């Protein structure tokens, strides 16, 4: 009830991307930043908040910078105890003005959106809302699956990451150099019919700007997990 479904030639083709696809896979395969009850601690540029979150997985950072579409959104969570989830990146991750192209520092990462208030957003009895994900490979429902989550109000990002991670392993959505699929958009559909999809394939070219891609999560779009429908659509170069 919002974004029109993608026209076949509006979507990206992996075979039009002559780079190392494995840079796309890095984002999704067991890769994310996770936080619970964290308060913003700094700000670089208006629309971005900085949080004290250490790299529990591989002690790579102890700081995380999530950028939001506008200062209005930044200023919003500035002093709000929240939860943080989303795929973080490194190349082009600057916190200070005196940082040249190529994040030279270490101990800090970057990301977009992924914030949701913590207050009462977690299930009454500590349950995990399951979200069904239906897969269509070449206009045919091939597989479906659910993705758990401890929030009533999650972010489409969180689900998309979780959605894709699952596929990397089961369908090899992204190989290290390529992918078996030509196209792939994850359609989000909420209770009110509102629809918004995202494109999994890298824009045709010989490069993949991880920081540029992850902006699809700049807005911090959140969804009611208990009633949202997610449809992963894929296509293969032949059939």
């Amino acid at each position: 009830e919002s974004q029109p479904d993608p026209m076949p030639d509006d979507l990206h083709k992996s075979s039009e991307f002559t780079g190392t696809m494995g840079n796309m896979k890095y984002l999704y395969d067991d890769h994310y930043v996770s936080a619970t009850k964290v308060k913003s601690v700094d700000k670089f540029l208006a629309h971005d908040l900085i949080y004290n979150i250490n790299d529990k997985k591989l002690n790579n950072y102890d700081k995380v910078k999530t950028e939001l579409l506008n200062e209005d959104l930044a200023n919003k969570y500035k002093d709000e105890v929240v939860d943080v989830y989303g795929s973080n990146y490194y190349v082009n991750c600057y916190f200070s003005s005196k940082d040249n192209v190529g994040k030279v520092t270490s101990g800090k990462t970057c990301m977009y959106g992924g914030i949701t208030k913590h207050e009462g957003n977690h299930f009454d009895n500590g349950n995990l809302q399951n979200v069904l994900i239906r897969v269509y490979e070449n206009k045919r429902n091939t597989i479906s699956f659910e993705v758990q989550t401890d929030k009533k109000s999650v972010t489409a990002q969180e689900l998309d990451i979780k959605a894709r991670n699952f596929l990397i392993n089961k369908k090899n959505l992204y190989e290290f150099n390529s992918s078996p699929y030509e196209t792939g958009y994850i359609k989000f559909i909420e209770s009110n019919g509102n629809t918004f999809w995202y494109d999994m394939m890298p824009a045709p070219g010989d490069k993949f700007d991880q920081s540029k891609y992850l902006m699809i999560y700049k807005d911090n779009k959140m969804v009611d997990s208990k009633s949202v429908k997610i449809e992963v659509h894929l296509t293969t170069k032949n059939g």
């Binding site: 540029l45 629309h47 600057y94 040249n100 494109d199 824009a203 700007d209 540029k212």
Partner: protein, 238 residues
């Protein structure tokens, strides 16, 4: 250190060129390599001490000399198109032992048919269109230096009078838009509000290197004295 000279050269076919290399490290060895787009860093000639110069992987066409311990100089007697490449000189430790070599800055040499082909570039500033893609912005500003030859240029960005390095995305290398024309393009992305502050200045300066003082220009047309070009613009109201 390990200096190099000249650091850029436009020579014509049939001409003799000489590139020197100095080493203030008191190393025994010195090497004369040539990096080629598509190929790797290749060894032409090297020397184990003053008064000795052994042939490397690719000696053909080049002579070299180790007249002093500090200097090693590669000589191109009959410069030809084939020698158009980037020469790296390395001082230090043994052959094939990169961990001990000290590389020099690099000399860009282009051996062209006739010096009247050397043209400074045109440089312009543009704004892409977010509406053209499903993804975001597609870079705030676009610098597009084109119609130049040979590629002895260095692009830069200067916001409000300062050279920035954050948010810039200059193409890895100049693309030959034609047999005698090169295209280049950097993209500086800033905060929209920043791009919308009419007080903010943006300068895309390209460094062109052409006919050096020792290159006699053929009488008949004006000689390209040009050095540094730039395209500027300011902020567009929010």
């Amino acid at each position: 250190a390990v200096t190099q000279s000249p650091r850029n050269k436009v020579a014509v076919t049939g001409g003799k060129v000489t590139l020197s290399c100095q080493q203030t490290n008191n190393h025994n060895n010195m090497y004369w390599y040539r990096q080629d787009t598509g190929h790797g860093l290749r060894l032409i000639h090297y020397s184990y001490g003053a008064g000795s110069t052994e042939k490397g992987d690719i000696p053909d066409g080049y002579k070299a000399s180790r007249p002093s311990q500090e200097q090693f100089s590669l000589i191109l007697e009959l410069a030809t198109p084939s020698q158009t490449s980037v020469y790296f000189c390395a001082s230090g430790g043994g052959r094939g032992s990169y961990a001990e070599q000290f590389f020099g800055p690099g000399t860009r040499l282009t051996v062209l048919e006739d010096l009247r082909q050397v043209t400074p570039p045109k440089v312009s500033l543009f704004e892409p269109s977010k509406a053209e893609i499903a993804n975001k912005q597609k870079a705030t500003l676009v610098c597009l230096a084109r119609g130049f030859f040979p590629d002895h240029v260095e692009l830069s960005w200067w916001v409000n009078g300062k050279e920035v390095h954050s948010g810039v995305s200059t193409d890895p290398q100049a693309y030959k838009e034609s047999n005698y024309s090169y295209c280049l393009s950097s993209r500086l992305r800033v905060s929209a509000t920043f791009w919308h502050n009419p007080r903010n200045h943006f300068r895309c300066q390209v460094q062109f290197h052409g006919l050096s003082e020792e290159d006699k220009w053929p009488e008949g047309s004006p000689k390209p004295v040009t050095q540094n070009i730039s395209a500027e613009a300011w902020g567009r109201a929010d």
